[PDB]
Amino acid sequence: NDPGNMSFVKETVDKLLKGYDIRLRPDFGGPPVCVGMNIDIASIDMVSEVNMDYTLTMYFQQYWRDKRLAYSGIPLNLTLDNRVADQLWVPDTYFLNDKKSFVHGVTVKNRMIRLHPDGTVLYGLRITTTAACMMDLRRYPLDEQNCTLEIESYGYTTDDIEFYWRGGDKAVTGVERIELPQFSIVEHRLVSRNVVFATGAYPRLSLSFRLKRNIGYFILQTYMPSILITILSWVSFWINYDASAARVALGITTVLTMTTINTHLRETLPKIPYVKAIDMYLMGCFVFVFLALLEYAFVNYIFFSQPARAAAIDRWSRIVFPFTFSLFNLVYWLYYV
Amino acid sequence: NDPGNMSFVKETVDKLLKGYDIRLRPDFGGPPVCVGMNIDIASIDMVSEVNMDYTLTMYFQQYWRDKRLAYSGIPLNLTLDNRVADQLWVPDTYFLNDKKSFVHGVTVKNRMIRLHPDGTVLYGLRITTTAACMMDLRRYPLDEQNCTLEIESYGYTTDDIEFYWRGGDKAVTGVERIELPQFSIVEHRLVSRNVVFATGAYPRLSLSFRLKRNIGYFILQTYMPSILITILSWVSFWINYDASAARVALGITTVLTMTTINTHLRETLPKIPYVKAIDMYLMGCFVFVFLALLEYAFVNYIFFSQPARAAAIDRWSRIVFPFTFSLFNLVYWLYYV
Amino acid sequence: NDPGNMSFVKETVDKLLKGYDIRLRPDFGGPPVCVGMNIDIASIDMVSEVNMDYTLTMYFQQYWRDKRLAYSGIPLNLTLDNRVADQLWVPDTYFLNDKKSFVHGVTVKNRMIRLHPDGTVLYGLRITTTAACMMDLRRYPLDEQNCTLEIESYGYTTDDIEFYWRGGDKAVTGVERIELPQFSIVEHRLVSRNVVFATGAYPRLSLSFRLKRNIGYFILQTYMPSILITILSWVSFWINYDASAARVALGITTVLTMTTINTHLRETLPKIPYVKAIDMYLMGCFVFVFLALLEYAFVNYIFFSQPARAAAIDRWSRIVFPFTFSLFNLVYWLYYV
Amino acid sequence: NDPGNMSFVKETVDKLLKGYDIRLRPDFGGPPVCVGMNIDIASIDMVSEVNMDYTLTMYFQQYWRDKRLAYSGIPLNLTLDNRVADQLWVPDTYFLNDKKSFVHGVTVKNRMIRLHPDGTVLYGLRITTTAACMMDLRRYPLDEQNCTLEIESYGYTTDDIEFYWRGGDKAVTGVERIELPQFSIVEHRLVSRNVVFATGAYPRLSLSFRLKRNIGYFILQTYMPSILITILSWVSFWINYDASAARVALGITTVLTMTTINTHLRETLPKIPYVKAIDMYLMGCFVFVFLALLEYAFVNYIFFSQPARAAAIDRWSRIVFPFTFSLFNLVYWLYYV
Amino acid sequence: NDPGNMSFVKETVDKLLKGYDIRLRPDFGGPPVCVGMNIDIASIDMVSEVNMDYTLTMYFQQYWRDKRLAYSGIPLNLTLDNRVADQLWVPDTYFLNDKKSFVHGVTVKNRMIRLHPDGTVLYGLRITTTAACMMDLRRYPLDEQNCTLEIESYGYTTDDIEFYWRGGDKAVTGVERIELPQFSIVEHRLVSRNVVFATGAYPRLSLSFRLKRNIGYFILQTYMPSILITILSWVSFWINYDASAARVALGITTVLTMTTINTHLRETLPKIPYVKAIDMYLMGCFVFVFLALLEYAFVNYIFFSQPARAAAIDRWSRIVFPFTFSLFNLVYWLYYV
Ligand SMILES: *[C@@H]1O[C@H](CO)[C@@H](O[C@@H]2O[C@H](CO)[C@@H](O[C@@H]3O[C@H](CO[C@H]4O[C@H](CO)[C@@H](O)[C@H](O)[C@@H]4O)[C@@H](O)[C@H](O[C@H]4O[C@H](CO)[C@@H](O)[C@H](O)[C@@H]4O)[C@@H]3O)[C@H](O)[C@H]2NC(C)=O)[C@H](O)[C@H]1NC(C)=O
Ligand SMILES: *[C@@H]1O[C@H](CO)[C@@H](O[C@@H]2O[C@H](CO)[C@@H](O[C@@H]3O[C@H](CO[C@H]4O[C@H](CO)[C@@H](O)[C@H](O)[C@@H]4O)[C@@H](O)[C@H](O[C@H]4O[C@H](CO)[C@@H](O)[C@H](O)[C@@H]4O)[C@@H]3O)[C@H](O)[C@H]2NC(C)=O)[C@H](O)[C@H]1NC(C)=O
Ligand SMILES: *[C@@H]1O[C@H](CO)[C@@H](O[C@@H]2O[C@H](CO)[C@@H](O[C@@H]3O[C@H](CO[C@H]4O[C@H](CO)[C@@H](O)[C@H](O)[C@@H]4O)[C@@H](O)[C@H](O[C@H]4O[C@H](CO)[C@@H](O)[C@H](O)[C@@H]4O)[C@@H]3O)[C@H](O)[C@H]2NC(C)=O)[C@H](O)[C@H]1NC(C)=O
Ligand SMILES: *[C@@H]1O[C@H](CO)[C@@H](O[C@@H]2O[C@H](CO)[C@@H](O[C@@H]3O[C@H](CO[C@H]4O[C@H](CO)[C@@H](O)[C@H](O)[C@@H]4O)[C@@H](O)[C@H](O[C@H]4O[C@H](CO)[C@@H](O)[C@H](O)[C@@H]4O)[C@@H]3O)[C@H](O)[C@H]2NC(C)=O)[C@H](O)[C@H]1NC(C)=O
Ligand SMILES: *[C@@H]1O[C@H](CO)[C@@H](O[C@@H]2O[C@H](CO)[C@@H](O[C@@H]3O[C@H](CO[C@H]4O[C@H](CO)[C@@H](O)[C@H](O)[C@@H]4O)[C@@H](O)[C@H](O[C@H]4O[C@H](CO)[C@@H](O)[C@H](O)[C@@H]4O)[C@@H]3O)[C@H](O)[C@H]2NC(C)=O)[C@H](O)[C@H]1NC(C)=O
Ligand SMILES: *[C@@H]1O[C@H](CO)[C@@H](O)[C@H](O)[C@H]1NC(C)=O
Ligand SMILES: *[C@@H]1O[C@H](CO)[C@@H](O)[C@H](O)[C@H]1NC(C)=O
Ligand SMILES: *[C@@H]1O[C@H](CO)[C@@H](O)[C@H](O)[C@H]1NC(C)=O
Ligand SMILES: *[C@@H]1O[C@H](CO)[C@@H](O)[C@H](O)[C@H]1NC(C)=O
Structure with a gap:
C-alpha cells in the first residue's frame, strides 16, 4: 500500500514484467517509437592520425516510452538495478563509424535503467568508442579536421523507430570541458536525418566536432x-x-x-x-x-x-x-x- | 487480429517458436536450403605487408527460407529483437581465410533478424574481419596485390546447404566508396563454386579485390x-x-x-x-x-x-x-x- | 541451531534469499543507504605522461546494511563464496575518470562477500584501473602533479545512496608503501562531496595524490x-x-x-x-x-x-x-x- | 518416421539427450574411450625468433564413440547445430605447448558436431594457436628448426582415454600447401605415446615440423x-x-x-x-x-x-x-x- | 552396481550434489579446511624490465577434503568433466602480485576435477600469469634478480582455510626444465606463513626464483x-x-x-x-x-x-x-x- 513497502514495489515490478515480450518494440505494428538521445562527453582521450581515428568516452542516454512498463500507485521514479536491462526492450542503437567500442564494467556494468509512472524509460550507458575520422593532412600541422560520430538503428526502419536529439542543440554537453593537448574544439554540431539503404529508410543522428591543431x-x-x-x-x-x-x-x-x-x-x-x-x-x-x-x-x-x-x-x-x-x-x- | 494488437502478434510469434528445434536445418532430410548472401563494405581499415593481412568492416546479410517460421494473417515483415537469433537456426557461415574477427556489440549486438510472411529470414551482422592476404613484393612498392575473402559453410555440405550471391554482381556494395590512403581499388569480382574435401563438397563464395599501390x-x-x-x-x-x-x-x-x-x-x-x-x-x-x-x-x-x-x-x-x-x-x- | 550444522546454515541462507529481489535497493522508497568505502592500494604500476594516465591496483571494499540479509541464531559472521554476489544487491559504484578497468579472475573472481548478523554486508573486489590524470608540464621536469581517483554511483542519486570514507582519513591504506620509479608521493587527500547533473545529485568520493617528480x-x-x-x-x-x-x-x-x-x-x-x-x-x-x-x-x-x-x-x-x-x-x- | 519428418528427428535427438550426463565420460569405469585425431593445417601465420613461438591455424577434428548417443530408424549422419556441442561430453583435449589459443566465433563458433547411427561422434574445431618453439640458433641463418605441437588430455589418464591418429600417417593434411616466406617445411612427423606425471600416465600426440630457413x-x-x-x-x-x-x-x-x-x-x-x-x-x-x-x-x-x-x-x-x-x-x- | 554401470555412477554423483551448497566452505563453523598446493611450472615465457614483470605458465593443483563429496561402493577415483567445477566449492586462491592472469580454454577450460572415496578433491588449472617483479637494475646487465609468486586466500581468514606446500620442498617441479635465453635459474625457495591484515590473519604461500642474467x-x-x-x-x-x-x-x-x-x-x-x-x-x-x-x-x-x-x-x-x-x-x- 505504502511506497515504502518493498514487497508492494516488487509485486508491481513483477506484474510489469509478467508476459513481457522483449522481442517486440513498444507499439509494435503501429506508430514508430520515438527515441530521444543525449550525450555527456567525459573526454576525448586521443586523436591518432596514424590510425586516423579518435577515442571518445561518453554517457550516452536514450529516452523512450514503453506503455507496457507503465505503473500506477507509486509516486516515484523507479531506478532499477542495471541487470533488469536484460529483461526489457532496448533500441538496437549502434555507432556507424566505430572500430572498437565497449561499455565499462567496473565495478558493475556502467548502465542505468530508470522507469517513470507514465511508462517512460531512461537508459544510460558509459561507452568508450574509437571512431574512424578520415583526415586531410595536406595542411599538416596547420590543418583543421572534422571528426563525426554517427548514430543509427541497426534493424528498425523509420516505420518502426525514430531518433531525435532530446533537448535540441543542448543535447550534447561537456564539449567545453574537453582537454585535447594538441587540438582545440572550434565548434560542434548536431544533425538529424533519414538515410535510404536497400533495406529501407533508417534514422541517423550525427555529432560533429571541428578540431583545430595547435602550432x-x-x-x-x-x-x-x-x-x-x-x-x-x-x-x-x-x-x-x-x-x-x-x-x-x-x-x-x-x-x-x-x-x-x-x-x-x-x-x-x-x-x-x-x-x-x-x-x-x-x-x-x-x-x-x-x-x-x-x-x-x-x-x-x-x-x-x-x-x-x-x-x-x-x-x-x-x-x-x-x-x-x-x-x-x-x-x-x-x-x- | 489487427497488427496493432500486440498480444495477437505475441501469440503468433510464440506459435512460430512453439516446438522449434534450433539443431535442425530447414528441410532437414530434404533438399539443400539455398542461402543467398550480400555484403556492404563500410571500410577497409588497414592493409599491412609486415603481417600480410587487411582489415575489413562490413554488413554481412544472409537470406534464406525456414517454413517453420511462416506466419499467416499479418501483412507485415516482423523485425524481431536481435536476441531472438539465439532461438533460430542460423547458417554456420565462416570466413575461410580470416585470422581474427568479431561482431560489434555497442550499444547492443549489431545484429538484425527480419521475418517475412512466407517464412523467409533475413539475418544481418556487422563484422570486422582481419583477413590474410599473401603478397608478391617482387615489384614493391610499384606492386599490385589481389586480396580475397572466402565465405564457406563450416559443417554442412552441398547436400544440405547452397551459397549464392543475392542480386548477382550487385551483391557487394560500397566498394567504390572506400577511402584507402595508400591503395586504390581497381576491380572487384565475385565467384561461386564448390570445393571438395575429405568430408564432402562444401559451397564457397569468393570476393576479390585488386589493389594498386600508390607511389x-x-x-x-x-x-x-x-x-x-x-x-x-x-x-x-x-x-x-x-x-x-x-x-x-x-x-x-x-x-x-x-x-x-x-x-x-x-x-x-x-x-x-x-x-x-x-x-x-x-x-x-x-x-x-x-x-x-x-x-x-x-x-x-x-x-x-x-x-x-x-x-x-x-x-x-x-x-x-x-x-x-x-x-x-x-x-x-x-x-x- | 548448531554452528557445525551446515544444513541449518544452508536453510538460514535459503531463507535469506527466499523472495529476495536484486532489482530493489535496501530500504527502497525510503532513506538513502550509506555505503562506506575503503581502499587498500597494492601498487601503482606506472604513471605515464605520454598517455596522461596511471595504473592502480587496489582492494576496493564497500560496506553497507541490508535488513533483508539479517539473520538470527548464528552468533558468527558468514564469509560466503563470492559467487553469491550474483544473487545480492550491490551498489553500482564506478570510477568516473577510468579508461580501462577490470576485476582479476584467477583462480576465481577476486571477490569477497561477508554477511553479519545485524544485516551488514561487506563486499570486496580486487581492481586494476587505468585512471586518466591530466598533467600540466609547464614546469616539467620540476613539476608537482595532482592525480585523482573519482568514485561515483552511476544510477542512484543522493536520495537513494550515500558514500562516505569508512574510517575517515585512515580509509585508504598502503599509500606510504607505493614505490613509484620516477615520482615520489607527498600527500594524499580524501574528499567526500556531492555533484549535480541534469539527472539529479550524485554522491562523490575523491582520492587525490600529489606527486613530486624526482629531479x-x-x-x-x-x-x-x-x-x-x-x-x-x-x-x-x-x-x-x-x-x-x-x-x-x-x-x-x-x-x-x-x-x-x-x-x-x-x-x-x-x-x-x-x-x-x-x-x-x-x-x-x-x-x-x-x-x-x-x-x-x-x-x-x-x-x-x-x-x-x-x-x-x-x-x-x-x-x-x-x-x-x-x-x-x-x-x-x-x-x- | 521419414527423414523428411523433422518432428521424428527432433524426438530422437531429445530422447538421446534425455538423461544424458555431461559429467561422465562414455563407458565410465570400463575400458578407456578411444579418441582419434585429424588435423587440417590451413596456414602458419608467422614463425618468430624473438618470441620463440609460431602461429598455427588448423581444423582439429576428434572422433570417438559414445553408445549413449546411438540412434536407430534414421539411416543418416546427423550434422547438428554447433550449439548442441554444449550438451555432450567432449574430450578435454588441450595443447601442451600453447600460449594463446582460441576457437573462431564468426559468424558462429567454428564448431561442428556430427552424430552417426552407431553412436560415433565427430567433433571439429577451427583453432588458431601460438605454440612455443624453443629454437637453437647456433647456426643461424643456416639453421634447421624442429617445431612441435603437443596434444594431451588434461584430466583423464590412460585408464580413461586413449589417443591415436585417425588415418595413420595421413592424419595431418595441408602441410604441402603451407606458404612460409622465410621457412620451408622439409618434413612432418606424427608421434603417439604416453607420458607419466605424478598424477598418472596420460596419452600424448605430437605433430612435428622440420623448418629449413631460406638463405x-x-x-x-x-x-x-x-x-x-x-x-x-x-x-x-x-x-x-x-x-x-x-x-x-x-x-x-x-x-x-x-x-x-x-x-x-x-x-x-x-x-x-x-x-x-x-x-x-x-x-x-x-x-x-x-x-x-x-x-x-x-x-x-x-x-x-x-x-x-x-x-x-x-x-x-x-x-x-x-x-x-x-x-x-x-x-x-x-x-x- | 558394477563400476562400468553408468547409471549407478550417475545416481551416486546426483546423491553427492543433492543438498550441496556451493556458498559454504567444508567444515563451515568448524576447524579450517587445509588446502595443500602443488605447482608444475611448464615454462617462463618472458622477463621484462620495461614493465618489470615475468610471464609464467604453470599447472596449479589444489588438494583439499570435503566430507560432503564422499562416495561409497565405488573403489575408483572419479575424474569428472571440468564443467562440474561450476557446481562445487573451490578455494578462493588468488596470486597476490599478478597483473594479468588467465586460464587456457582450448579446446576446453584447462581444468581438472578428481574426486576420491574419502571426500578428497584434486582441482587443477593451467594458468599463464604475468607476475610483477621489481628489479634492482643498478648492476645491469650483470645483475641477479629475485622474482616471487605470492599465493593467498582472498576472503577466508586463517580460521576458515589453511595453506601448505603439499609434498614439502618438492611441491614445485619443472624448474630445471625452464629455458630462458637471457636468464638462468640459480635457486628457488618455498615459503609458508601467515600475514596479519586488518581483517585478521590470512594464509600465504611464496615461490621465489633467483635469475642470473647471461652476459x-x-x-x-x-x-x-x-x-x-x-x-x-x-x-x-x-x-x-x-x-x-x-x-x-x-x-x-x-x-x-x-x-x-x-x-x-x-x-x-x-x-x-x-x-x-x-x-x-x-x-x-x-x-x-x-x-x-x-x-x-x-x-x-x-x-x-x-x-x-x-x-x-x-x-x-x-x-x-x-x-x-x-x-x-x-x-x-x-x-x-
Ligand atoms: C563535418 O562535415 C559534415 C558533412 O560531411 C557536416 O555535416 C553537415 O552539417 C550541415 C549543417 O551544418 C547539414 O545541413 C543540414 O542538414 C539537415 C539534414 O539534411 C537531410 O534532411 C533534409 C530534409 O530534412 C534533406 O533536404 C537533406 O538532403 C538531408 O537528407 C537539414 O535538415 C538542414 O536544413 C536546415 O537548413 C536549411 C537551410 O539551409 C533549412 O531550410 C532547414 O529548415 C534547416 O534549418 C541542413 O541542411 C548537413 O546535412 C550535414 N551533412 C551530412 C552529410 O549530414 C558537419 O557539420 C561538419 N562538422 C562540423 C563541426 O561542422
Ligand atoms: C585473385 O586471385 C583469385 C585466384 O586465386 C581470382 O579468383 C578467380 O577468379 C576467376 C574469375 O575471374 C575464377 O574463374 C571462374 O571460376 C568459376 C568457378 O569455377 C568452378 O566451377 C567450374 C564449373 O562451373 C569448375 O570447372 C571449376 O573447377 C570451379 O570449381 C567458373 O564458373 C568461371 O567460368 C567462366 O569462364 C568460363 C571460361 O573460362 C566460361 O565458360 C563460364 O561461362 C564463365 O564465364 C571462371 O572460370 C576462378 O575460379 C577464381 N579462382 C579462385 C581460386 O577463386 C580472383 O579473381 C583474383 N582477383 C581479381 C580481382 O581478379
Ligand atoms: C587535486 O585537485 C583536487 C581538485 O581537482 C583537490 O580536491 C579538492 O580538495 C579540497 C580540500 O582540500 C576540497 O574542498 C573541500 O570540499 C568539501 C566538500 O564541499 C562540497 O560539499 C559541501 C557539502 O558536503 C558543500 O557545502 C560545499 O559547498 C561543496 O559543494 C568541504 O567539506 C571541505 O571543507 C573542509 O575544508 C574547509 C576549508 O577549506 C573547512 O572550512 C571545512 O570545515 C572542512 O574542513 C573542503 O572545502 C575540494 O572540493 C576538492 N575539489 C574537488 C573538485 O573535489 C585535491 O585536494 C588535489 N590534491 C591534493 C593532494 O591536494
Ligand atoms: C623433433 O624432436 C622430437 C624430440 O624432441 C622428435 O620426437 C621424437 O621422434 C621419435 C621418432 O623420430 C620418437 O621415437 C619413437 O617413439 C615411438 C613411441 O614410443 C613410445 O613408447 C615406448 C614404449 O613402447 C617408449 O619407450 C617411448 O619413450 C615412447 O613413450 C616409438 O614407437 C618409435 O619406435 C620406433 O623405433 C623403435 C626402435 O627404437 C622401433 O622398434 C619401432 O618399430 C619404431 O621404428 C620411436 O622410438 C620419439 O619418441 C619422439 N620424442 C618426442 C619427445 O616426441 C621429433 O621427431 C623431431 N621432429 C622431427 C620433424 O623429426
Ligand atoms: C627473494 O626475496 C624474498 C624476500 O623478499 C625471499 O623470501 C624469504 O625467504 C626466507 C628464507 O630464505 C624466509 O625466511 C623464512 O621465513 C619463515 C616464515 O617466518 C614467518 O612465520 C614464522 C612461523 O611460520 C614466524 O616464526 C616468523 O616470525 C615469521 O612470521 C620461517 O619459518 C623460516 O624459518 C626458517 O629458519 C629458522 C631459523 O632462522 C628455522 O628455525 C625454521 O625451521 C626455518 O628453517 C625462515 O625464517 C622469509 O620469510 C622470506 N620472505 C618473506 C617475506 O616471506 C626469497 O627467498 C628470495 N628469493 C630466493 C630465491 O631466495
Ligand atoms: C506490504 O504489501 C504486502 C502486499 O500487498 C502486504 O501483504 C503487507 O501487509 C504490506 N505491508 C505493510 C507494512 O503495509
Ligand atoms: C488481441 O489478440 C488476443 C489473442 O488472440 C485476443 O485475446 C484479444 O482479444 C485481441 N484484442 C482485441 C482487442 O481483439
Ligand atoms: C512425423 O513424426 C511424428 C513423431 O514421431 C509423428 O507423430 C507423425 O505422425 C509423423 N508424420 C509422418 C507424416 O510421418
Ligand atoms: C545400474 O544401476 C541402476 C541403478 O541401480 C540399475 O537400475 C541398472 O539396472 C544397473 N545396470 C545393470 C546393467 O544392472
Missing part, C-alpha cells in the same frame, strides 16, 4: 630548428674564402642535420601519397642549405681564375640568401595561414 | 632522399682534389647516409627471400655513391703518375656520373612501370 | 650535457684567431649537439603546445652557444684591419660569457623554485 | 655486402702509401659499413648468449677490414724510415689478404654446410 | 663494438701527424660511432632514476675517444711551432691511452664482479 609544439620542434640550421649555414658566408675545410664542414653538417631534423615524423604519421606543409617547409630549407653548399663549391671552382670574383660572390650571397629565405617564409606562411 | 609516399620518402644523397656525393667532383678533407668528409658522409637509408628500408619490411624493386634502386644508388669515393681514390692513385690525368678524370666524371645515373633511372622506371 | 635523473640527463656543451663552446675563446678551422668546428659541434639534445628530450613527451622549463633552459643554452659562434665570426670578419680590437673583444668575451651564463642559470633556477 | 635474404643482405666491403677494403693496397686521405677514408668507410651490416639484423632476434653463424662471418670480415686499416697504419708509420719495406708490405698484403679471405670462406662454408 | 649477448653486441671503436681511435694515433684529413675523419667518425652504440638497447630499457653499468662503460669509452680526438687536435694546433713536442706527445699518447683504458677496464670489471 606551439611544431614551432618548438620543427620550424625553429630548420630556421636555425639555415642561419648557421648562412654563417659560412662571412667566413674567409681560404678556409676550404671549414666551409665544406659547415655545408655538410648543415645538410645532414637538416636531413635528420624530422626523422620523428615517419612514425607519427600514416602513409599518404601527397606532400604536407611540414614536408614543403623542410624541402625548402634543405634546398636553401644545399644551394649554400653549391655556392661555396662554385666559389672554390672559380677562385683561381678571379680572386676578386669569389669575394664578390660571397658578398652578394651574404644578402641574397637571407632575403630569398625571408621571401620564401613570407609566401609559405601567407599561403598556409 | 607518392615512397617517391617522397625513399627515392628522393637517395637521389639527393647521390647528388651530394657528386658534389665532390667540382671540389679541387687538393682539398682532401672536403672530399673525404663528403664521401664518408654520403656512404654512411646511404647505408642508413637502406637499413631503415629493410627494417620497415619483412624477410622475403627475393629482391624488391626498391631494394634494387637502393643498391644502385649505393653503387653510385661508392663509385664516387672509388673515383676519388682513383684520382689519388693516378695522381702519383701524372697530374693532368687527375684533373681530366674529374672533368670527365662531371659528365659521366650524371649521364650514367640518368640512364639507370630511365631503364629502372621504364621497366617497373 | 636527479633529468639533472644528469638533460642539463649536464647542455652545460658541458656550453663550456666546450666557451673553450673556443682561448683559441687564437688564426686557427679558423678549430673554432668553426667547435661552433658547429656545439650548436648541432644542442639541437640533437633538444630532439633527445622531445622524443620522450607528448605533443603539448606550451613551453616547458627544460625547453627554456635548452633555448638559453642554444642562445649562449650561438652568441659565442657569432662572436668568433665577428672577430674573424674584422681581425685583419683591427687586430687589437679583435684581441680585446676575445678577452672581454672570455670574461663575460661565464658571468652571464652563471647569472642566467641562477635566475632560472630561482624562477622555478 | 636468399641473408645472401642478399649480409654475405654479399660483407664480401663487397672486404674487396673494396683490399682496393686500398694499390693506392700509394703517401695518399693518406684516400686510403684512410677507404678504411674508415669499409669498417663503418661493416658495423652497419652487423647492426642490421640485431633487432629481429632475441638476446641469445651464444654466437650465431652470421656473427662469426661478420666478425671475420670486420677483422679483415680492420687488419687492412691497421696494415696501412703500420706502413704509414714505417714509411719515412723504411720505404722499401713499406712497399714490400703493400705488395705482400695484395696477395695475403685475398688468399686469407678465400681460406676463411672455404673453412666457414665447409663448417656450416 | 654473453651484451659482450657480442655492446662491449666489443665500443672496444673496437676505442682501438680505432688508437689506430688514429699511429698515423703520421702531418696527415690532417685522415686523423680528423677517423676521430670524428669514432666519436659519432661511439655515441651511436647502445641506441638499440636503450629502447627496451626503463627510465630508472639511476645509472646502469652499461651506461658507465659507454661513458668511459666515449670519454676516451673524445680525449683521443682532443689530443690530436692539440697536436695539430701546436704542430708548426714545436714538432719535437708534438712527436713526444704522440709517443706518450700511444702508451698512455691503451694503459689507461686497460686500467679502466680492470677497475670496471672488478667493481661489478
